[PDB]
Short mmCIF file of all heavy atoms in Angstrom, two decimals:
data_model
loop_
_atom_site.label_atom_id
_atom_site.label_comp_id
_atom_site.label_asym_id
_atom_site.label_seq_id
_atom_site.Cartn_x
_atom_site.Cartn_y
_atom_site.Cartn_z
N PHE A 304 64.63 171.74 -2.99
CA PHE A 304 63.26 171.65 -3.50
C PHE A 304 62.40 170.93 -2.58
O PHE A 304 61.20 171.35 -2.39
CB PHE A 304 63.26 171.01 -4.89
CG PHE A 304 61.96 171.05 -5.66
CD1 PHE A 304 61.44 172.23 -6.03
CD2 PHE A 304 61.20 169.91 -5.90
CE1 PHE A 304 60.21 172.38 -6.67
CE2 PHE A 304 59.93 169.98 -6.48
CZ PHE A 304 59.51 171.23 -6.89
N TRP A 307 61.76 173.22 0.24
CA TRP A 307 60.86 174.24 -0.20
C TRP A 307 59.45 173.80 -0.25
O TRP A 307 58.49 174.46 0.25
CB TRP A 307 61.40 174.69 -1.59
CG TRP A 307 60.41 175.70 -2.21
CD1 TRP A 307 60.32 177.08 -2.06
CD2 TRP A 307 59.36 175.41 -3.15
NE1 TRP A 307 59.30 177.59 -2.68
CE2 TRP A 307 58.68 176.66 -3.50
CE3 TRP A 307 58.94 174.25 -3.77
CZ2 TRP A 307 57.59 176.78 -4.31
CZ3 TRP A 307 57.77 174.36 -4.65
CH2 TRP A 307 57.15 175.62 -4.93
N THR A 308 59.23 172.58 -0.79
CA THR A 308 57.91 171.96 -0.84
C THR A 308 57.32 171.81 0.52
O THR A 308 56.15 172.17 0.69
CB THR A 308 58.02 170.56 -1.49
OG1 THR A 308 58.45 170.75 -2.90
CG2 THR A 308 56.59 169.85 -1.56
N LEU A 311 55.86 174.91 2.00
CA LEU A 311 54.58 175.41 1.41
C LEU A 311 53.41 175.02 2.28
O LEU A 311 52.27 175.49 1.95
CB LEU A 311 54.48 174.68 0.02
CG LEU A 311 55.36 175.05 -1.09
CD1 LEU A 311 55.08 174.30 -2.39
CD2 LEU A 311 55.23 176.60 -1.37
N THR A 326 64.38 179.55 -0.47
CA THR A 326 63.99 179.97 -1.86
C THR A 326 65.27 180.49 -2.44
O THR A 326 65.57 180.21 -3.66
CB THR A 326 62.88 181.02 -1.86
OG1 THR A 326 61.70 180.47 -1.28
CG2 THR A 326 62.60 181.38 -3.33
N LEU A 329 67.92 177.77 -3.30
CA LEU A 329 67.37 176.95 -4.40
C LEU A 329 67.53 177.68 -5.69
O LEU A 329 68.11 177.14 -6.66
CB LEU A 329 65.91 176.59 -4.11
CG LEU A 329 65.20 175.77 -5.16
CD1 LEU A 329 66.05 174.54 -5.56
CD2 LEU A 329 63.92 175.35 -4.68
N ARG A 330 67.10 178.92 -5.74
CA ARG A 330 67.23 179.74 -6.92
C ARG A 330 68.73 179.84 -7.37
O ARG A 330 69.02 179.91 -8.61
CB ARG A 330 66.59 181.13 -6.75
CG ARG A 330 65.07 181.08 -6.59
CD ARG A 330 64.47 182.52 -6.72
NE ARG A 330 63.02 182.49 -6.40
CZ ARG A 330 62.17 181.81 -7.19
NH1 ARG A 330 62.51 181.13 -8.25
NH2 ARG A 330 60.82 181.83 -6.85
N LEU A 333 69.72 176.67 -9.18
CA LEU A 333 69.14 176.52 -10.51
C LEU A 333 69.74 177.49 -11.50
O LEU A 333 69.97 177.10 -12.63
CB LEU A 333 67.60 176.76 -10.40
CG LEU A 333 66.79 175.76 -9.48
CD1 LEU A 333 65.31 176.23 -9.48
CD2 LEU A 333 66.87 174.32 -10.11
N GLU A 337 71.76 176.45 -14.94
CA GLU A 337 71.36 176.87 -16.37
C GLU A 337 72.55 177.60 -17.03
O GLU A 337 72.78 177.39 -18.23
CB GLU A 337 70.16 177.85 -16.25
CG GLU A 337 68.87 177.19 -15.76
CD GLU A 337 67.71 178.07 -15.89
OE1 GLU A 337 67.33 178.33 -17.06
OE2 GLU A 337 67.13 178.53 -14.89
N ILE A 377 64.79 168.73 -15.72
CA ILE A 377 64.62 168.62 -14.34
C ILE A 377 64.50 170.02 -13.73
O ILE A 377 63.71 170.26 -12.82
CB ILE A 377 65.97 167.94 -13.76
CG1 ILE A 377 65.89 166.44 -14.05
CG2 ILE A 377 65.96 168.13 -12.19
CD1 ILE A 377 67.13 165.70 -13.54
N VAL A 378 65.35 170.96 -14.22
CA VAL A 378 65.34 172.33 -13.80
C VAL A 378 64.01 172.95 -14.10
O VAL A 378 63.43 173.62 -13.20
CB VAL A 378 66.45 173.11 -14.45
CG1 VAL A 378 66.31 174.61 -14.15
CG2 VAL A 378 67.77 172.64 -14.02
N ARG A 379 63.51 172.80 -15.31
CA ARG A 379 62.29 173.39 -15.75
C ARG A 379 61.10 172.93 -14.84
O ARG A 379 60.32 173.77 -14.43
CB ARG A 379 61.92 172.94 -17.20
CG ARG A 379 60.42 173.05 -17.46
CD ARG A 379 60.10 172.65 -19.00
NE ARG A 379 58.70 172.47 -19.16
CZ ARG A 379 58.06 172.33 -20.32
NH1 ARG A 379 58.77 172.33 -21.46
NH2 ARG A 379 56.76 172.26 -20.33
N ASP A 380 61.06 171.64 -14.66
CA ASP A 380 59.99 171.20 -13.68
C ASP A 380 59.99 171.85 -12.31
O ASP A 380 58.86 172.11 -11.82
CB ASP A 380 60.12 169.63 -13.58
CG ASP A 380 59.85 168.95 -14.89
OD1 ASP A 380 59.18 169.43 -15.80
OD2 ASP A 380 60.29 167.82 -15.00
N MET A 381 61.18 172.05 -11.85
CA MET A 381 61.31 172.73 -10.51
C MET A 381 60.81 174.18 -10.64
O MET A 381 60.10 174.67 -9.75
CB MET A 381 62.71 172.61 -10.05
CG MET A 381 63.09 171.26 -9.30
SD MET A 381 64.71 171.16 -8.69
CE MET A 381 64.61 172.28 -7.42
N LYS A 382 61.29 174.88 -11.66
CA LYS A 382 60.95 176.28 -11.80
C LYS A 382 59.44 176.42 -12.05
O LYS A 382 58.81 177.39 -11.62
CB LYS A 382 61.72 176.89 -13.03
CG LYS A 382 63.29 176.86 -12.84
CD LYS A 382 63.96 177.44 -14.00
CE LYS A 382 63.83 178.91 -14.13
NZ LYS A 382 64.73 179.52 -15.16
N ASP A 383 58.89 175.53 -12.85
CA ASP A 383 57.43 175.57 -13.20
C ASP A 383 56.64 175.43 -11.87
O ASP A 383 55.68 176.22 -11.66
CB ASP A 383 57.12 174.45 -14.08
CG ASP A 383 57.54 174.65 -15.49
OD1 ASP A 383 58.03 175.76 -15.79
OD2 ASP A 383 57.39 173.76 -16.32
N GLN A 384 56.97 174.51 -11.06
CA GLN A 384 56.19 174.31 -9.82
C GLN A 384 56.33 175.48 -8.85
O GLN A 384 55.41 175.97 -8.33
CB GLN A 384 56.70 173.04 -9.08
CG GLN A 384 55.95 172.79 -7.79
CD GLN A 384 54.42 172.65 -7.95
OE1 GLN A 384 53.88 171.81 -8.56
NE2 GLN A 384 53.68 173.67 -7.44
N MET A 385 57.61 176.00 -8.81
CA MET A 385 57.75 177.21 -7.97
C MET A 385 56.96 178.36 -8.44
O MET A 385 56.42 179.18 -7.69
CB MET A 385 59.30 177.61 -7.96
CG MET A 385 60.09 176.64 -7.15
SD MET A 385 61.91 177.11 -7.16
CE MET A 385 61.88 178.51 -5.96
N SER A 386 56.82 178.48 -9.83
CA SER A 386 56.00 179.54 -10.35
C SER A 386 54.56 179.27 -10.18
O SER A 386 53.71 180.22 -9.99
CB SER A 386 56.37 179.65 -11.92
OG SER A 386 55.53 180.63 -12.50
N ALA A 387 54.12 178.08 -10.15
CA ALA A 387 52.70 177.65 -10.00
C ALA A 387 52.28 177.77 -8.58
O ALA A 387 51.04 177.72 -8.30
CB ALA A 387 52.50 176.18 -10.47
N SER A 388 53.21 177.95 -7.68
CA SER A 388 52.92 178.09 -6.24
C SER A 388 52.92 179.58 -5.84
O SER A 388 53.25 180.43 -6.72
CB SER A 388 53.96 177.36 -5.34
OG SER A 388 53.87 175.92 -5.58
#
Side-chain angles (χ1 to χ4, degrees):
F304 187 65
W307 173 80
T308 295
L311 291 180
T326 300
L329 177 50
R330 291 192 186 296
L333 298 174
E337 298 189 66
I377 290 178
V378 173
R379 159 179 167 171
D380 296 334
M381 282 182 64
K382 301 177 71 172
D383 286 355
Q384 178 58 66
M385 287 180 81
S386 176
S388 295

